[PDB]
């Protein structure tokens, strides 16, 4: 099997990665000592993408936890999966950037990028073959977004023939009190347009909306958001973790879902979302394409699905799933582009996530993601027309033309998204 | 005195080839370990299966098969679940898949492995003294099965220009498709392997799925077993006693008039759940819903017909079935000596998998017929190609691996010329 090296940058990336790894190790039947204890041979199949095989039946993950504060590493080690992770792969700085993108992109990310490059090269030179790099980080923070984009640039320089999959978390004002987050988000969006081939746009605004409306929980606690994003990430990666008709092993997913090198912003979603219940096929399918259910602040009625990869998990009849999805596609033919035929790919995995009898995960390159890049850019416009906190970033050697370049690139992306939405077959 | 070297490219090619060689060992009575109970008393070749099976010094009947794929999972599946039957030297694996990209299998990933496959092909051909050609097993939708097939066809046309090469392609279907760019791969591998292929039995999985649904969703195992049965009864005449179509030149001359029009159509009557008269099973071979290509032959004109009967079928009533077929006004032949149904009958009954998907039957029939009804399928494929090229969708995944932008326009011009030539054949 091929090998993926997992990279987590920032405390948001570290926390969501720890919850995601716990969900995977519960799903794959791996205990805290790294020994297999599951009851299905499919769980041990395709395990080399994520878990490195150590001595004496020890399946440790190939996770590179990167941060600039040791408190996040202490919180990772204090959890249940702390001894399960590789102790040699821990990289932590002394001083955090603290919502400073320039400090994590030009000084401290630059001063630790040689060490993380040495760790990445040590992991890569032991690879029989490299499949790609999976990155999970937040676009709003200081070392998260800046160090993620610097790692992306270094990986694209070193390995230009490898895929770059990013679980970029777009910041939102409803859960984050910091004001300078449109600067970091727009700068990282401009870097991810030019130096990345894949992006899973998980938005905290839609997560707060889901926890407020669906789960009826007023408080947007970070544990519930961690659990929801971990469940959606497990449902997304069930194609890579288990063999099937739709393998979608990174490059195949990019060939199927990405028609253009700039328009590679996905929209993951999870239909049976329940906090810490009859499940059937048509209710899951009608919950799959709902605006409220999706984890990005978008309106799918205003956009067109360029590609859809709906994956079902559990024990279900495949014929009924195919019939229901064909009925959905024919009933809503105005919601899909007519110049890309057969854009809906369905795969069924027999192993459900733990805690759920059935699961339904959807990935889509909808045109409705340009509403998110209009919202973040217009919050960036209200923070750049009055130059709020501009002395921090421009004092680190960043030119003020960099913000104009990022705004122009995001406006060009919005213009190209609208232009390709207006075209019809 | 004659040999054939089977070539399987892609996951579909490897799985179809493994199922087909399993059915060939089942039909000929060859043991799975490689020995033969009855025919190993001679210990030599030319026993009517020497065109496919080679005998080593230990008496093992190893097939003359090359399994090539850029993913080693299916190769290790063949090598584990067979192992002593297939030599590991002739089973070539690969490291990185082309991942539903023609240009990846044609310019970068397949080009680093084409020389080893050519050397293995020459090594297997050195044991053959009177070899006829190669059977290419591949699939149109994949990345390996299109790009590496096109580069292999180019290399075998440059190096083996005195030989004729068949083709066993899988036409993409919307029911089971793992990619969106299957029209792009299919059009590009049709344009590249137009001048290098002489008989292409392109069968779509939609027809096999519909047959499995209405006679037998069914998985890839049932589709693989039915397709292996179809291909085994297609190539039943080549491994048995000589009546007709026992050579690749016979296949190229009985059905293919043009250098470009080399797409036959197969049709199978006896699909029953695990009797029937000769007239109805001859009539069922003319049913458009039982064909291996989802198309209507009544809007086109036939060019040839090679009915191959299997089992204990009396040859007297075959001519009466032919007369009752020809009395109907559905079949409209071409008007330059169209001949008719060149029936050859093999008296050995076909063997089905014990407890598999098809029941054992006594009367079996296959209709290898050329027509102009494949032009509808090529029109569908070019319509899907034209819908994804007006806005230049998915273009960058091919140009980034060394291909050019003008190759798509060249393949579009080639497919327009193929459609125009099919229309010119279809118009008196
Ligand atoms: C328009 O009027 C306003 C309305 C609201 C507010 C809200 C008000 N200020 C901001 O968000 C400003 C962020 C700019 C960055 C600047 C750009 C960082 O590079 C600076 C840096 C920091 C540390 C080390 C090196 C460099 O500071 C932070 O991130 C600091 C980090 C420090 C305390 C550890 O953290 C916070 O700010 C808190 C303490 C967590 C919360 N702060 C707020 O709620 C402010 C104003 Cl002025
Ligand atoms: N009938 C049948 N078709 C198959 C089988 N396996 C793959 N296919 C066809 O393969 C097409 C997609 O190609 P891929 O999934 O990339 O497999 P491939 O053609 O071997 O190409 P590679 O994966 O690169 O080797 C689908 O449209 C299927 O019709 C099989 O076992 N049986
Ligand atoms: N969904 C989710 N988002 C988070 C979580 N923690 C932080 N974030 C987001 O991440 C951003 C802060 O980035 P952070 O990782 O703290 O950057 P750092 O301090 O430089 O390491 C904020 O805008 C939050 O919206 C979490 O547990 N869940």
How do the domains of chain B map onto residue ranges? 2-264, 265-373, 374-428
Give residue A261 CA to ligand 3 midpoint distance, Å: 27
Best of A132, A341, A365, A425 to disrupt the B interface by mutation (most B CBs within 10 Å)?
A: A341
Task: Output the CA angle B60-B63-B69, nearest 5 degrees.
Answer: 130
Q: What are phi and psi of B278, to 5 degrees?
A: -70, -35
Task: Output the CA angle A86-A91-A94, nearest 5 degrees.
Answer: 145
Cα separation, B392 vs B390, in Å, equals: 6
Contact call for residues B140 and B202 (beta carbons, < 8 A): yes
Q: Is B245 exposed, middle or buried (CB count within 10 Å of its CB: 0-12, 13-18, 19+)?
A: buried
| A247, A255, A425 ranked by CB distance to B387: nearest | A425
Contact call for residues B239 and B30 (beta carbons, < 8 A): no
Task: Output the CA angle A305-B145-B179, nearest 5 degrees.
Answer: 10
A222 CB contacts (<8 Å, ≥6 apart)? A15
Residue A1, SS3 per DSSP: coil
Of all residues in chain A, the one with the smallest CA distance to B72 is: A1
Contact call for residues B163 and B202 (beta carbons, < 8 A): no
Which pair of tokens denotes residue A305?
A: 């699905």
Which pair of tokens denotes residue B139?
A: 């699939």
Residue B136, SS3 per DSSP: strand
Contact call for residues A370 and A262 (beta carbons, < 8 A): no
Query: Ligand 2, residues B142, B203, B219: which to mutate, most atoms within 8 A of Cβ?
Result: B142
Cα separation, B15 vs B78, in Å, equals: 8
Q: Is A216 exposed, middle or buried (CB count within 10 Å of its CB: 0-12, 13-18, 19+)?
A: exposed
What are the residue ranges of helices labelled H in A126-221? 143-158, 181-195, 204-213
Task: Output the CA angle B171-B174-B176, nearest 5 degrees.
Answer: 85
Q: What are phi and psi of A299, to 5 degrees?
A: -120, 100
Cα separation, B214 vs B32, in Å, equals: 33
Best CA proximity match to A207, nearest among A189, A223, A228? A228
Best CA proximity match to B373, nearest among B334, B305, B422? B422
- Other Cβ atoms less than 10 A from the Cβ of B275: the count is 8
- With b for 16 or more beta-carbon neighbours within 10 A and e for fewer, the A341-366 pattern comes to bbbbbbbbbebbbeebebbbbbbbbb
Which pair of tokens denotes residue B414?
A: 């080639």
Say which experimental method was used.
cryo-EM
Atom of ligand 2 nearest to the CA of B140: 19
B176 part of contact set with chain A, CB < 8 Å: yes
- Which neighbouring-strand residues pair with B61? B55
> What DSSP line would sit under A367-422, residue for residue?
GGGGTHHHHHHHHHHHHHTTTTTHHHHHTTT--THHHHHHHHHHHHHHHHHHHHHH
Cα separation, A220 vs B342, in Å, equals: 77
A5 CB contacts (<8 Å, ≥6 apart)? A62, A64, A120, A123, A124, A127, A130, A133, A134
Tell me, what DSSP letter sits at residue A223? Answer: H
Active-site choice (B250, B376, B405, B410): B250
Q: Whose CA is nearest to atom 45 of ligand 1?
A: A179
Which pair of tokens denotes residue A80?
A: 């249940």
Tell me, what DSSP letter sits at residue A267? Answer: -
Give residue A389 CA to ligand 1 midpoint distance, Å: 9
Beta strand A91-92 with A63-67: parallel, antiparallel or unpaired?
Answer: parallel
- A394 sits in the region (left: phi over 0; alpha: psi -120 to 50; else beta) called alpha
Of all residues in chain B, the one with the smallest CA distance to A343 is: B180
Beta strand A359-366 with A269-270: parallel, antiparallel or unpaired?
Answer: antiparallel
Put simply, the answer to whether B393 touches A259 (Cβ < 8 Å) is yes
Q: Is A37 exposed, middle or buried (CB count within 10 Å of its CB: 0-12, 13-18, 19+)?
A: exposed
Of all residues in chain A, the one with the smallest CA distance to B217 is: A319
Cα separation, A327 vs A320, in Å, equals: 10
Put simply, the answer to whether A342 touches B390 (Cβ < 8 Å) is no
User: Which CATH number is B265-373's, of 3.30.300.30, 3.40.50.2300, 3.30.1330.20, 3.40.50.920?
Assistant: 3.30.1330.20
Q: After which residue numbers is chain B interrupted with C–N beyond 2.5 angstroms?
A: 81, 216, 274
Cα separation, B200 vs B335, in Å, equals: 24
Cα separation, B138 vs B196, in Å, equals: 14
Long-range Cβ contacts of A406-410 (<8 Å, 24+ apart)? A406/A186, A406/A187, A406/A189, A406/A190, A407/A186, A407/A377, A407/A380, A407/A381, A409/A189, A409/A190, A409/A193, A409/A194, A410/A186, A410/A189, A410/A190, A410/A193, A410/A373, A410/A376, A410/A377
Cα separation, B170 vs A36, in Å, equals: 39
Ligand whose nearest atom lies closest to the CA of A103: 1
Is B221 a pocket residue for ligand 2 (Cβ < 6 Å)? no
- Angle, nearest 10°, between helix axes A181-195 and A401-422? 60
Contact call for residues A117 and A154 (beta carbons, < 8 A): yes
- B311 sits in the region (left: phi over 0; alpha: psi -120 to 50; else beta) called left
What are the residue ranges of helices labelled H in B264-405? 278-284, 315-326, 374-387, 396-399
Cα separation, B245 vs B253, in Å, equals: 9
Contact call for residues A184 and A178 (beta carbons, < 8 A): no
* Residues in chain B closer than 8 A to A341 (CB atoms): 174, 183, 384, 387-388
**Quick one: how far is CA B31 from the chain centroid?**
25
A45 part of contact set with chain B, CB < 8 Å: no
Best CA proximity match to B282, nearest among B244, B331, B229? B331
Contact call for residues A77 and A369 (beta carbons, < 8 A): no
**Quick one: how far is CA B247 from the chain centroid?**
15
B298 CB contacts (<8 Å, ≥6 apart)? B288, B330
- Other Cβ atoms less than 10 A from the Cβ of B197: the count is 22
Long-range Cβ contacts of B377-383 (<8 Å, 24+ apart)? B377/B171, B377/B202, B377/B204, B377/B293, B377/B294, B377/B295, B378/B190, B378/B415, B378/B418, B378/B419, B378/B422, B379/B419, B381/B183, B381/B186, B381/B187, B381/B190, B381/B415, B382/B187, B382/B412, B382/B415, B382/B416, B382/B419
Which pair of tokens denotes residue B360?
A: 């054992």
Residue B359, SS3 per DSSP: coil
Best of A4, A252, A309 to disrupt the B interface by mutation (most B CBs within 10 Å)?
A: A252
Is B187 a pocket residue for ligand 2 (Cβ < 6 Å)? no
A120 CB contacts (<8 Å, ≥6 apart)? A5, A7, A64, A155, A158
> What DSSP line would sit under B112-132, residue for residue?
TTHHHHHHHHHHHHHS-SSEE
C-alpha separations of B320 from A331, B278, B282, B303, B331 in Å: 50, 9, 10, 21, 16
Resolution of the PDB structure in angstroms: 3.5
Best CA proximity match to B409, nearest among B389, B391, B394, B393? B389
Longest dimension (CA), chain A: 61
Residue B142, SS3 per DSSP: coil
B387 part of contact set with chain A, CB < 8 Å: yes
Contact call for residues A305 and A335 (beta carbons, < 8 A): yes
Contact call for residues A217 and A275 (beta carbons, < 8 A): yes
Best CA proximity match to A385, nearest among A396, A370, A400? A400
Cα separation, A97 vs A91, in Å, equals: 15
Residue B346, SS3 per DSSP: strand
User: What's the CA dihedral at A117, A119, A122, A127 to 10 degrees?
Assistant: -90
Best CA proximity match to A246, nearest among A317, A325, A289, A310? A310
Task: Output the CA angle B117-B118-B121, nearest 5 degrees.
Answer: 85
Which pair of tokens denotes residue A99?
A: 């919502």
Tell me, what DSSP letter sits at residue A301? Answer: G
Which pair of tokens denotes residue B15?
A: 């799985």
How close A227 comes to chain B (CA, Å)?
A: 30
Sheet strands side by side (includes B302-311): B344-346, B302-311, B363-371
What are the residue ranges of helices labelled H in A79-164? 101-102, 108-125, 143-158
Cα separation, A285 vs A289, in Å, equals: 7
Contact call for residues A170 and A185 (beta carbons, < 8 A): yes
**Quick one: how far is CA A172 from the chain centroid?**
16
Cα separation, B282 vs B278, in Å, equals: 6
The count of residues in chain B is 428
* Class of the CATH domain delimited by B374-428: mainly alpha
Contact call for residues A52 and A6 (beta carbons, < 8 A): no
How close A184 comes to chain B (CA, Å)?
A: 29
Residue B106, SS3 per DSSP: helix
Cα separation, A340 vs B383, in Å, equals: 11
Contact call for residues B38 and B81 (beta carbons, < 8 A): no
A44 CB contacts (<8 Å, ≥6 apart)? A36, A38
Cα separation, B164 vs A190, in Å, equals: 54
CATH 3.40.50.620 fits B2-264, yes or no: no
Query: Which residue reads 């008989």 in tokens?
Result: B199
Answer yes or no: is A11 a known binding residue: yes
Cα separation, B345 vs B366, in Å, equals: 11
A128 CB contacts (<8 Å, ≥6 apart)? A3
Q: Whose CA is nearest to atom 21 of ligand 3?
A: A10
Based on the residue annotation, tell me whether B250 is a catalytic residue of this protein: yes
A339 part of contact set with chain B, CB < 8 Å: yes
Which pair of tokens denotes residue A92?
A: 């932590």
Beta strand B363-371 with A359-366: parallel, antiparallel or unpaired?
Answer: unpaired
Q: After which residue numbers is chain A interrupted with C–N beyond 2.5 angstroms?
A: 276
Beta strand A305-313 with A269-270: parallel, antiparallel or unpaired?
Answer: unpaired
Query: Which residue reads 């297609």 in tokens?
Result: B234
- B46 sits in the region (left: phi over 0; alpha: psi -120 to 50; else beta) called left
Contact call for residues B366 and A323 (beta carbons, < 8 A): no
**Quick one: how far is CA A364 from the chain centroid?**
13
Q: Is B427 exposed, middle or buried (CB count within 10 Å of its CB: 0-12, 13-18, 19+)?
A: exposed
The H or E element spanning position B307 is strand B302-311
Ligand whose nearest atom lies closest to the CA of A16: 3
């Amino acid at each position: 099997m091929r090998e993926i090296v997992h990279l987590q940058i920032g405390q948001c990336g570290n926390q969501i990665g720890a919850k995601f790894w716990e969900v995977i190790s519960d799903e794959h039947g791996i205990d805290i000592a790294g020994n297999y204890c599951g009851n299905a041979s499919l769980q041990l199949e395709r395990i080399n993408v994520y878990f490195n095989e150590a001595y004496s039946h020890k399946y440790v993950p190939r996770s590179i936890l990167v941060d600039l504060e040791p408190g996040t590493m202490d919180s990772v080690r204090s959890s249940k999966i702390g001894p399960l992770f590789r102790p040699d792969n821990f990289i932590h700085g002394n001083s955090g950037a603290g919502n400073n993108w320039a400090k994590g992109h030009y000084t401290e990310g630059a001063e630790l990028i040689e060490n993380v490059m040495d760790v990445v090269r040590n992991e890569c030179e032991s690879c029989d073959c490299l499949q790609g790099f999976q990155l999970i980080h937040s676009l709003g923070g200081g070392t998260g977004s800046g160090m993620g984009t610097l790692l992306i640039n270094k990986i694209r320089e070193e390995y230009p023939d490898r895929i770059m999959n990013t679980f970029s978390v777009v910041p939102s004002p409803k859960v984050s009190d910091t004001v300078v987050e449109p600067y970091n988000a727009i700068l990282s969006i401009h870097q991810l347009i030019e130096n990345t081939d894949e992006t899973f746009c998980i938005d905290n605004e839609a997560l707060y909306d889901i926890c407020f409306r669906t789960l009826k929980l007023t408080n947007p606690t970070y544990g519930d958001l961690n659990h929801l994003v971990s469940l959606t990430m497990s449902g997304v990666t069930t194609s890579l973790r288990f063999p099937g008709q739709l393998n979608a092993d990174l490059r195949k997913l990019a060939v199927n879902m990405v028609p253009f090198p700039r328009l590679h912003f996905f929209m993951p979603g999870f239909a049976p979302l329940t906090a810490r219940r009859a499940l059937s096929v048509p209710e899951l399918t009608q919950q799959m394409f709902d605006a409220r259910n999706m984890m990005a602040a978008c309106d799918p009625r205003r956009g067109r699905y360029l590609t859809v990869a709906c994956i079902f998990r559990g024990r279900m009849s495949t014929r009924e799933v195919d019939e229901q999805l064909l009925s959905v596609q024919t009933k809503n033919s105005s919601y899909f582009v007519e110049w890309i035929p057969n854009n809906v790919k369905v795969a069924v995995c027999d192993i459900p996530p733990r805690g759920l009898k059935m699961a339904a995960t959807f990935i889509g390159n909808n045109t409705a993601i340009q509403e998110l890049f209009i919202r973040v850019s217009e919050q960036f416009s209200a923070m750049f027309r009055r130059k709020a906190f501009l002395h921090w970033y421009t004092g680190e050697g960043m030119d003020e033309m960099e913000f104009s370049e990022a705004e122009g690139n995001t406006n060009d992306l919005v213009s190209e998204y609208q232009q390709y939405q207006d075209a019809t077959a | 005195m004659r040999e054939c070297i089977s070539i399987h490219v892609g996951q579909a090619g490897v799985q179809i080839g493994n199922a087909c060689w399993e059915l060939y060992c089942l039909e000929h009575g060859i043991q799975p370990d490689g020995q033969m109970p009855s025919d190993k008393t001679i210990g030599g070749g030319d026993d009517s299966f020497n065109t496919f099976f080679s005998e080593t010094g230990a008496g093992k009947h190893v097939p003359r098969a090359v399994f090539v794929d850029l993913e080693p999972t299916v190769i290790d599946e063949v090598r584990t679940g067979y192992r002593q039957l297939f030599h590991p030297e002739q089973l070539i694996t690969g490291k990185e898949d082309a991942a539903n990209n023609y240009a990846r299998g044609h310019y970068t990933i397949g080009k680093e492995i084409i020389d080893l496959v050519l050397d293995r092909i020459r090594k297997l051909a050195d044991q053959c003294t009177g070899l006829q050609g190669f059977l290419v097993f591949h699939s149109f939708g994949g990345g390996t099965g299109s790009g590496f097939t096109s580069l292999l066809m180019e290399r075998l046309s440059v190096d083996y220009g005195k030989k004729s090469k068949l083709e066993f392609s899988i036409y993409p279907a919307p029911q089971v498709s793992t990619a969106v760019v299957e029209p792009y791969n299919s059009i590009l591998t049709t344009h590249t392997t137009l001048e290098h292929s002489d008989c292409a039995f392109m069968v779509d999985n939609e027809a096999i799925y519909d047959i499995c649904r209405r006679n037998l969703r069914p998985t890839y195992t049932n589709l693989n077993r039915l397709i292996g049965q179809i291909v085994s009864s297609i190539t039943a005449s080549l491994r048995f006693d000589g009546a007709l179509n026992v050579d690749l030149t016979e296949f190229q001359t009985n059905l293919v008039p043009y250098p470009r029009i080399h797409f036959p159509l197969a049709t199978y009557a006896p699909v029953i759940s695990a009797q029937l008269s000769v007239a109805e099973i001859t009539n069922a071979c003319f049913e458009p819903a039982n064909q291996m290509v989802k198309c209507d032959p009544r809007h086109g004109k036939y060019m040839a017909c090679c009915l191959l009967y299997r089992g204990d079928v009396v040859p007297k009533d075959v001519n009466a079935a032919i007369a009752t077929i020809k009395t109907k006004r559905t079949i409209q032949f071409v008007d330059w000596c169209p001949t008719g149904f060149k029936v050859g009958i093999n008296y050995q009954p076909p063997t089905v998998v014990p407890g598999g998907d098809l029941a054992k039957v006594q009367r079996a029939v296959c209709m290898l017929s050329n027509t102009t009804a494949i032009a509808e399928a090529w029109a569908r494929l070019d319509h899907k190609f034209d819908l994804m090229y007006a806005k230049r969708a998915f273009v960058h995944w091919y140009v980034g691996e060394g291909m050019e932008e003008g190759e798509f326009s060249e393949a579009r011009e080639d497919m327009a010329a193929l459609e125009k030539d099919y229309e010119e054949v279809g118009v008196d």
